[PDB]
Amino acid sequence: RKVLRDNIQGITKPAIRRLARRGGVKRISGLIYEETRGVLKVFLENVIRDAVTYTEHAKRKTVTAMDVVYALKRQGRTLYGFGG
Amino acid sequence: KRHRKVLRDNIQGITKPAIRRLARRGGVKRISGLIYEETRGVLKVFLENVIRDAVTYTEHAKRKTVTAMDVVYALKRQGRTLYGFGG
Amino acid sequence: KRHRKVLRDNIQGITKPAIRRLARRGGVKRISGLIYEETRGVLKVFLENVIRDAVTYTEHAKRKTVTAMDVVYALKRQGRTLYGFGG
Amino acid sequence: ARAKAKTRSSRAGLQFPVGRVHRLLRKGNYSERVGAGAPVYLAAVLEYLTAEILELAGNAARDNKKTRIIPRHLQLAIRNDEELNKLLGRVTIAQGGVLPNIQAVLLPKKTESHHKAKGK
Amino acid sequence: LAGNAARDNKKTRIIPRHLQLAIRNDEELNKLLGRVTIAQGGVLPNIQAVLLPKKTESHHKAKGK
Amino acid sequence: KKRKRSRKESYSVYVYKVLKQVHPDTGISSKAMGIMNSFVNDIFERIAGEASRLAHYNKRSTITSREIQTAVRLLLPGELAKHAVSEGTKAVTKYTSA
Amino acid sequence: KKRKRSRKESYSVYVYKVLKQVHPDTGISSKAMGIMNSFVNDIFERIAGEASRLAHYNKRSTITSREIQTAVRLLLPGELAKHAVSEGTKAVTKYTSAK
Amino acid sequence: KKPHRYRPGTVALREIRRYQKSTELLIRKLPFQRLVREIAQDFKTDLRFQSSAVMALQEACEAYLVGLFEDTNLCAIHAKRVTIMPKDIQLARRIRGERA
Amino acid sequence: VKKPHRYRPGTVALREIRRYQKSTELLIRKLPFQRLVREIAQDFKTDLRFQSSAVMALQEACEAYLVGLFEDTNLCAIHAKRVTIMPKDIQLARRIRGER
Amino acid sequence: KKPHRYRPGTVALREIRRYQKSTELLIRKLPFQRLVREIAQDFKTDLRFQSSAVMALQEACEAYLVGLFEDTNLCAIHAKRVTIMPKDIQLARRIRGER
Numbered sequence: 044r045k046v047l048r049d050n051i052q053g054i055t056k057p058a059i060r061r062l063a064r065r066g067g068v069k070r071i072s073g074l075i076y077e078e079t080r081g082v083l084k085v086f087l088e089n090v091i092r093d094a095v096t097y098t099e100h101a102k103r104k105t106v107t108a109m110d111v112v113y114a115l116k117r118q119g120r121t122l123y124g125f126g127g
Numbered sequence: 128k129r130h131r132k133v134l135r136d137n138i139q140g141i142t143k144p145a146i147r148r149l150a151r152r153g154g155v156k157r158i159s160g161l162i163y164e165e166t167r168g169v170l171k172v173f174l175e176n177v178i179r180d181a182v183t184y185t186e187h188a189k190r191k192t193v194t195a196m197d198v199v200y201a202l203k204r205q206g207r208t209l210y211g212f213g214g
Numbered sequence: 215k216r217h218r219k220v221l222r223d224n225i226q227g228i229t230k231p232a233i234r235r236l237a238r239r240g241g242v243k244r245i246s247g248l249i250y251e252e253t254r255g256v257l258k259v260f261l262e263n264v265i266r267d268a269v270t271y272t273e274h275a276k277r278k279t280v281t282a283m284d285v286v287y288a289l290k291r292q293g294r295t296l297y298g299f300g301g
Numbered sequence: 302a303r304a305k306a307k308t309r310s311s312r313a314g315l316q317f318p319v320g321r322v323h324r325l326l327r328k329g330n331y332s333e334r335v336g337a338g339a340p341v342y343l344a345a346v347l348e349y350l351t352a353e354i355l356e357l358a359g360n361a362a363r364d365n366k367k368t369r370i371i372p373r374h375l376q377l378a379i380r381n382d383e384e385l386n387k388l389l390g391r392v393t394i395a396q397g398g399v400l401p402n403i404q405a406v407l408l409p410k411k412t413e414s415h416h417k418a419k420g421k
Numbered sequence: 422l423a424g425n426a427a428r429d430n431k432k433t434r435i436i437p438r439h440l441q442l443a444i445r446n447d448e449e450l451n452k453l454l455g456r457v458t459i460a461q462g463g464v465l466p467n468i469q470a471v472l473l474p475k476k477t478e479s480h481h482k483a484k485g486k
Numbered sequence: 487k488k489r490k491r492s493r494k495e496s497y498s499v500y501v502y503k504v505l506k507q508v509h510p511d512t513g514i515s516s517k518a519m520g521i522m523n524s525f526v527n528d529i530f531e532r533i534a535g536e537a538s539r540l541a542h543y544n545k546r547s548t549i550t551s552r553e554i555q556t557a558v559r560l561l562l563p564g565e566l567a568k569h570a571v572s573e574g575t576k577a578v579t580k581y582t583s584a
Numbered sequence: 585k586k587r588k589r590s591r592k593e594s595y596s597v598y599v600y601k602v603l604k605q606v607h608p609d610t611g612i613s614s615k616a617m618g619i620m621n622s623f624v625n626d627i628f629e630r631i632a633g634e635a636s637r638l639a640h641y642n643k644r645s646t647i648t649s650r651e652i653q654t655a656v657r658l659l660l661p662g663e664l665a666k667h668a669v670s671e672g673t674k675a676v677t678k679y680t681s682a683k
Numbered sequence: 684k685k686p687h688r689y690r691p692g693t694v695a696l697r698e699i700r701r702y703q704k705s706t707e708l709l710i711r712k713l714p715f716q717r718l719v720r721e722i723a724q725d726f727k728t729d730l731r732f733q734s735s736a737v738m739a740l741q742e743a744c745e746a747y748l749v750g751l752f753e754d755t756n757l758c759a760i761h762a763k764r765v766t767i768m769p770k771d772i773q774l775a776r777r778i779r780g781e782r783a
Numbered sequence: 784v785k786k787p788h789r790y791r792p793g794t795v796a797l798r799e800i801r802r803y804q805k806s807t808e809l810l811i812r813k814l815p816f817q818r819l820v821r822e823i824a825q826d827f828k829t830d831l832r833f834q835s836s837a838v839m840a841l842q843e844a845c846e847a848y849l850v851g852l853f854e855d856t857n858l859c860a861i862h863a864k865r866v867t868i869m870p871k872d873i874q875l876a877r878r879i880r881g882e883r
Numbered sequence: 884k885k886p887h888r889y890r891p892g893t894v895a896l897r898e899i900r901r902y903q904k905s906t907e908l909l910i911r912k913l914p915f916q917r918l919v920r921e922i923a924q925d926f927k928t929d930l931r932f933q934s935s936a937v938m939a940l941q942e943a944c945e946a947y948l949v950g951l952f953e954d955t956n957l958c959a960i961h962a963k964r965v966t967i968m969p970k971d972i973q974l975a976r977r978i979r980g981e982r
Contacts, residue, residue, distance in 0.1 A: 045818055045821055045822040045825065047822060049818065050815075050818040050819045050821075050822040051819065053812075053815030053816065053818060053819055054811060054815070054816075054819070055812075055815070058810050058811050058812065061799075061803060061810045062810045062811065062846060062849050062850055062853070063849075063850070063853040063868075064796070064799050064800050064803050065399055065800075065803045065804055065810070065850050065853075066399070066850050066851075066853035066854040066857060067402065067403055067404060067407070067800055067804075067853075067854060067857045068800075068853055068856075068857045068868050069407045069793070069796050069797065069800065069866055069867075070796070070866055070867040070868070071867070071868055072867050072868065072869045072870065074869075074870045075868055075869070075870060075873070077870075078870045078873050078874075079849065079873070082849075082852065082873070082877075083819075083845055083849060084819070084823070086845055086848060087819060087820065087823050087841065087845055088823055090841060090844065090845075091820060091823050091824050091827070091841070092827055093658055094837070095824065095827045095828050095831065096654060096657055096658055097638075097641075097654075098828075098831070099654075099828070100638060100642065100650070100651075100654045101642055104830065104831060104832060105831075105832050105833070105834055106824075106831055106832075106833050106834065106837050107834050107836075107837060108834055108836040108837040108840050109641075110837070111837045111840045111841055111844075112840060113641070115840075115844055117658070119391060120391060120393060120844065120848070121391060121392050121393070121528070122392075122393050122395065122840060122843070122844055123392050123393070123394055123395065123521050123524040123525065123528070124372075124394060124395025124396070124517070124520050124521045124524060124843075125395050125520075125836060125839060125840035125843060126524070126840065127496075127520075127523060127524065127527070128215035129215040129216070130215050130216065131216075132216050132220055133717050133720050133721050133724075134721075134928065135721060137714065137717040137718040137720075137721045138718060138721075140714035140715070140717060140718055141710060141714070141715075141718075142711075142714075145709055145710045145711070148702065148709045149709050149710070149745060149748050149749055149752070150752045150767070151695065151698045151699050151702050152699075152702045152703055152709070152749055153749055153750075153752030153753045153755075153756060154699065154752070154753055154756045155752050155755070155756055155767050156692060156695055156696075156699070156765060156766070157692065157695075157765060157766035157767075158766070158767055159766055159767060159768045159769065161768070161769045162767055162768070162769060162772070165769050165772050166748065166772075169747075169748070169751060169772070169776075170744060170748060173744060173747055174718060174719060174722050174740065174744060175722050177740065177743065178719070178722050178723060178726060179726055180560060181736075182723070182726040182727055182730065183556060183559055183560055184540075184543075184556075185730070186727070187540060187544065187552070187553075187556045188544050191729055191730065191731055192730075192731045192732075192733060193723075193730055193731075193732055193733070193736050194733050194735070194736060195733060195735035195736045195738070195739050196543075197736070198736050198739040198740060198743075199739065200543060202739070202743055204536075204560070207743060207746070207747075208626070209739055209742065209743055210618075210619050210622040210623065210626070211615075211618050211619050211622065211742075212735060212738055212739040212742060213622075213735070213739065214592075214621075214622070214625075218728075218729070219728070220724065220728060221728075221921075222917060222918075222920060222921025222924060223914060223917030223918045223920070223921055224921070225918065226914060226917075226918070227910060227911055227913075227914020227915055227917070227918060228910065228914075232909055232910045232911070235902065235909040236909050236910075236945065236948050236949055236952065237952045237967070238895065238898050238899050238902045239899075239902045239903055239909070239949050240949055240950075240952030240953045240955075240956060241899065241952070241953055241956045242952055242955070242956050242966075242967050243892060243895055243896070243899070243965060243966065244892065244895075244965060244966030244967075245966070245967055246966055246967060246968045246969065248968070248969040249967060249968070249969060249972070252969050252972055253948070253972075256948070256951065256972070256976075257944060257948060258922075260944060260947055261918060261919060261922050261940065261944060262922050264940060264943065265919065265922050265923055265926060266926060268936075269923065269926040269927055269930065272930070273927070278929055278930065278931055279930075279931045279932070279933060280923075280930055280931075280932050280933070280936050281933050281935070281936060282933060282935035282936045282938070282939050284936070285936050285939045285940060285943075286939060289939075289943055294943060294946070294947070296939055296942060296943055299935065299938060299939040299942055300935055300939055312581060312584055313577050313578070313580055313581040313584075314577070314580060315577055316500060316503050316504055316507075317497070317500050317504075318497070318500060321495075321497075322530070325530070326534055326549075329534070329640065330636070331534045331535075331537065331538045331549065332537070332538050332541050332547070332548065332549045333547050333548070334547055334548040335548070335549055336548050336549055336550035336551065336553075338550055338551040338578055338581075338582075339537075339549050339550060339551055339553070339554045341551075341574075341577060341578050341581050342551045342554045342555060342574045342577070342578055343530070343533060343534070343554050345570075345573055345574040345577040345578075346529070346533065346554075346558055346562075346570050346573070346574055347526055347529055347530060348504065349566075349569065349570050349573045349574075350525075350529055350566070350570070351500075351501060351504045351522075351525075351526065352504055352508050353566070354522065354525055355501070355504055355505050355508050355509070355522075356508045356509065358518075359505075359508070359509045359512045362512060363476050363477060363478070364470075364473070364476060366475050366476075366478065368511065368512055368513065369512065369513055369514065369515045369518075370505075370512060370513075370514050370515070370518050371515050371517065371518060372515075372517045372518060372521055372807065373807050375518060375521055384563045384564055384565050384566050385566075386783065387563050387783060388561075388562065388563055388566075389525075390783065392528075393843070393844060393847045394521055395517070395520070395521060395843055396517065396807050396843070397807060398804075398805070398806065398807045399804050399850065401801075401804050401805060402804075403797070403800055403801070404857070404858075404861060405429075406861055406866070407797070407861075407866055408429075408797070409431075409793055409794065409797060410428050410429055410431060411793075412428055412431060412433065754879050757875065757878060757879065758859075758862065758875075758879075761859070761862070761863060761871075761875060762862060762863045762864075763863070770862075771862075774858065774859065774862055775879060777855075777858060778855050778858070778859070778876060778879045778880060779879055779880065779881075780880075
């Protein structure tokens with residue numbers, strides 16, 4: 044079952060620090076952990092709503108990797124590699 | 128006759144009051160003294176970048192006159208999109 | 215009213231033959247192709263430096279003409295004493 | 302009759318294909334009639350730029366003591382340059398990494414910190 | 422520019438070395454005091470890249486391939 | 487049923503050959519071929535995407551060398567523009583005089 | 585000019601007629617025609633533009649009605665999309681009946 | 684409010700309110716004609732600018748500058764200060780991504 | 784003998800900003816990120832089946848935008864003389880960048 | 884037909900011997916008169932140069948250049964090469980201390 048809470052409590056507190064110690068931050072306040080689950084559910088909504096629209100155009104029911112490489116390209120963040 | 132050409136005093140042509148009227152439309156309340164030299168650095172880089180792409184389109188058409196549908200076609204690429212002073 | 219060209223000689227007149235005449239006095243036998251752009255970059259940082267000190271003396275006397283005794287006085291400070299061109 | 306022939310690329314001495322950038326420039330509907338002097342110019346600008354991701358990367362593989370140009374060695378060569386980080390400046394490279402940087406103010410230098418029982 | 426290089430090395434006195442690490446970095450102050458020798462200064466760290474360890478890899482004959 | 491798997495087309499033989507002239511000892515792992523085919527297919531899209539706009543703005547119907555050259559002067563940054571415009575001019579000149 | 589000179593094309597006559605339907609007894613200045621005529625000529629090059637790429641990825645060679653419906657779904661934003669995908673189909677319905 | 688003196692920082696709120704409600708350009712037209720002409724000399728000489736080209740450049744350049752100041756202001760109010768300064772302009776340019 | 788060399792606050796965090804900035808692997812666990820992508824796609828079209836290379840091209844672009852908003856919230860928390868990123872910093876970086 | 888093409892590099896030894904035995908300046912006076920005029924514009928405008936000032940600047944500038952090329956040559960003969968190249972000019976300037 045995709046329990047709503049479980050899916051977002053999936054980005055756990057240790058991995059919201061180790062994804063931030065790769066940027067330089069030395070001390071992290073307690074409330075950063077809540078806001079940073081908010082900004083990764085309003086980014087995935089926008090990338091996974093423009094991969095569904097291309098998938099429907101070709102009358103397919105599987106979201107292929109090339110479609111995500113074409114959803115990201117439109118919004119200004121091209122990804123080179125996991126696609127062609 | 129006109130025995131003179133345009134020197135490089137122009138970058139100081141923007142006066143101290145003009146940068147205090149384009150910043151009071153911005154919400155700024157107490158402009159600091161050193162800002163006036165910095166704001167003549169940010170404008171100076173920008174005016175060159177729209178200009179180099181503007182000349183590059185004109186030389187493609189082998190003309191000698193930079194018409195405004197060339198500025199409007201340069202400003203789209205960099206980022207903005209002036210609507211109006213052009214077609 | 216104005217010479218149409220305003221290039222003020224852009225590091226020009228140092229044509230391939232002139233740099234292949236100065237080098238041969240030096241002892242160079244087979245000058246390579248890329249040297250010509252570089253030797254127009256070393257002449258450039260020298261002609262400016264004798265000049266900045268030369269104008270600095272003339273403005274001290276308030277005169278508007280750079281006489282040769284000013285260039286001999288500037289050249290001593292950097293390190294090379296030209297003997298006699300001005301005296 | 303009609304003779305025997307050789308590749309157009311060899312005739313102009315360019316390694317990158319000059320007969321495949323003509324089909325891909327005409328079957329994409331970029332323009333109605335392709336000049337024949339344009340496939341050759343555009344198979345040289347790509348090749349000059351290919352070496353800009355194949356030489357700076359290789360020189361950064363010797364420095365880490367390895368003989369293959371793996372995906373990270375590609376980032377340390379397109380993020381350490383000043384005219385190749387202003388072209389590929391939004392692209393994200395798969396399985397890459399970040400360039401090492403720690404801002405100076407954070408580095409340990411509190412100098413005994415102070416405010417404690419007078420260390421005097 | 423010398424005190425700021427004493428906090429970085431964790432000391433509270435501007436001793437003679439901390440004076441070289443501040444007059445051998447700034448470009449305006451290394452083109453004025455460019456012949457002077459400080460009394461017990463030392464030198465600024467720099468190892469040329471070509472000789473760094475291995476790099477070209479000391480295998481030579483590398484018998485095999 | 488039939489075989490005839492669609493034959494995928496990639497610029498990957500040509501990238502190996504440029505590695506060989508520039509460095510004769512190194513080799514590229516499979517992922518770097520992926521992060522390199524994508525680069526070649528991205529600069530081609532920008533240069534033939536500003537050529538087509540230039541051909542149309544000045545009413546015209548063909549992309550000749552000057553048009554594929556105005557783009558390199560605009561899309562590529564500062565230094566790489568000067569070297570690349572020259573590298574192409576030498577390569578086209580050889581084609582005509584042969 | 586009139587020395588055998590060329591004639592430009594503007595969507596300026598059409599905009600005036602729309603102004604009359606939504607708000608009667610109101611007028612537009614010629615400076616405000618210039619901002620509006622550019623917008624009608626900029627939304628044409630974004631909605632048509634995504635359609636060209638969509639046709640190529642699929643491999644199909646025609647830009648038909650379905651393609652100008654996926655472009656309106658992606659380029660436009662939230663509730664100015666549901667109110668415009670619906671409006672267009674109604675006009676395609678009527679044309680299919682008569683032309 | 685003796686016309687002789689209004690306390691510091693109260694004339695400017697009247698200035699902000701009046702300036703935000705009108706659209707006339709704020710840099711003088713004759714001096715800006717020259718800055719563009721000087722910058723053009725290096726790219727080519729013998730370039731003749733039509734009247735509209737120097738008008739558009741005025742209505743884009745004012746707009747980039749009006750914007751940087753609103754973002755510099757947002758940064759200043761963050762540190763508890765109420766005045767723009769030289770350091771604040773640089774944080775706005777690194778974040779927006781222009782300088783690199 | 785009660786000294787496990789307890790490190791003072793600040794020496795076990797500058798030995799992790801230096802071991803995570805020199806590696807190429809992915810920090811977020813794969814299985815908990817194969818349920819966030821599916822819950823956010825059970826509202827747009829029901830019964831959509833994701834491929835195995837498109838649940839890794841979404842992890843590598845939602846772990847390279849977060850590590851790009853933590854270098855613009857550690858250049859804004861050093862402008863107010865603090866070393867601790869706080870939730871009023873992440874909100875400022877978004878307004879200037881353009882993503883509000 | 885007499886091509887009389889001396890083999891490569893033997894015309895130049897005759898050139899070196901003849902050039903080292905005379906003192907006439909090797910850069911033309913009219914072009915040099917202008918390079919100084921351009922580099923003077925930035926420091927001040929309205930500066931008038933007497934005839935001798937351009938002449939002195941020509942003798943010092945030829946002399947710095949003649950020298951850099953006897954030291955670049957000495958560096959080239961060290962690596963076993965016989966021709967000056969762009970890289971050699973930068974070792975001479977780092978060692979002499981000009982930087």
